[PDB]
Amino acid sequence: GIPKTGGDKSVINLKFILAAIDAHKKLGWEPAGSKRIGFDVADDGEDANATTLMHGNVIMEVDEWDGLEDELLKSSSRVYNLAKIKGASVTYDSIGVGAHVGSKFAELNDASPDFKLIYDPFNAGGAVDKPDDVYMKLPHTTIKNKDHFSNIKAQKWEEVATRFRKTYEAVEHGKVYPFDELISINSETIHPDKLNQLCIELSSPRKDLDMNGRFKVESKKDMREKRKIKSPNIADSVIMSAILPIRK
């Protein structure tokens, strides 16, 4: 329903995530579309760097590695080379340590004669895409995107959750959607440990409220302090890998 605070409701219901595992095999489509990498950048020892590779609407690869700011170059190079091998764009956490990532990418693009990496910064607290669009129509007013979402992070998290929910509807209830509106997790290219961790992490952050009454994702800080839960870096990389480019 409406955005609320407290409770224990996941932004992405675990049963949606389970239903999405090999959902493209169950429903009958193969990965087709743009290739995108989400790159979450570690900020403390409590964090790890995470990458998620999606092809179209299918999560294809997940990876995790340690590294702080003083090896950022190496990390950046890693993500660059992955992007060159997979032929993918990159959306990366651009706050904190990530504020120093763009430079690195630029350098590599400047040295590359053939490959130009398309990379976009993602500021979780930034403004929502299409703020004046209608999120929900009412008898005489409309809830706008700017009325429902606290920030762009909430917007992207709910967009991915909507993908998972439609996928659950299609798998468990036989409901019909255009396949591009769904999402799938490719088990054959993801280690079972990583698949389990992905399922746990994506369903870890809870629904919350900002002080304007807009939907907000439970903060990492609140997860760590109020609930003593590790940072779901892989889930953040997944959310960033699902982001579709805007302005053209």
- What span, in angstroms and rounded, lies between the C-alpha atoms of 162 and 152? 15
Looking at the chain, which runs of residues are DSSP E strands?
35-40, 49-55, 58-65, 89-93, 119-122, 134-137, 142-144, 184-185, 207-209, 215-217
Which part of the chain contacts Mg ion (CB under 5 A), choosing from 37-45, 64-72, 150-158, 217-225? 37-45
# chain residues binding Mg ion, by CB under 5 A: 5
CB of 146 to Mg ion, least distance (A): 25
Measured CA to CA in angstroms, residue 162 lies from 16, 55, 185 at distances of 9, 18, 15
Cβ-based nearer residue to Mg ion, 158 or 236: 236
Cβ-based nearer residue to Mg ion, 38 or 98: 98
Q: Judge whether 198 and 191 are in contact, CB under 8 Å.
A: no
Q: Work out whether 218 is an interface residue with Mg ion (CB under 5 A).
A: no
Which part of the chain contacts Mg ion (CB under 5 A), choosing from 12-20, 43-51, 56-64, 117-125? 43-51
The closest alpha carbon to 14, from 212, 205, 234, belongs to 205
The pair of three-digit structure tokens given for residue 167, joined into one six-digit string: 């996928």
The pair of three-digit structure tokens given for residue 83, joined into one six-digit string: 């992007």
Using the rule CB under 5 A, which residue among 16, 36, 43, 76 binds Mg ion?
43
CB of 134 to Mg ion, least distance (A): 32
Q: Work out whether 236 is an interface residue with Mg ion (CB under 5 A).
A: no
Site string for Mg ion, 83-102 (x = CB under 5 A): ----------x--x-x----
- What span, in angstroms and rounded, lies between the C-alpha atoms of 133 and 202? 27
Q: Work out whether 41 is an interface residue with Mg ion (CB under 5 A).
A: yes
Q: Which residues would be at the binding site for Mg ion (CB under 5 A)?
A: 41, 43, 93, 96, 98
Positions at the binding site? 41, 43, 93
* Binding site per annotation, positions for Mg(2+): 41, 43, 93
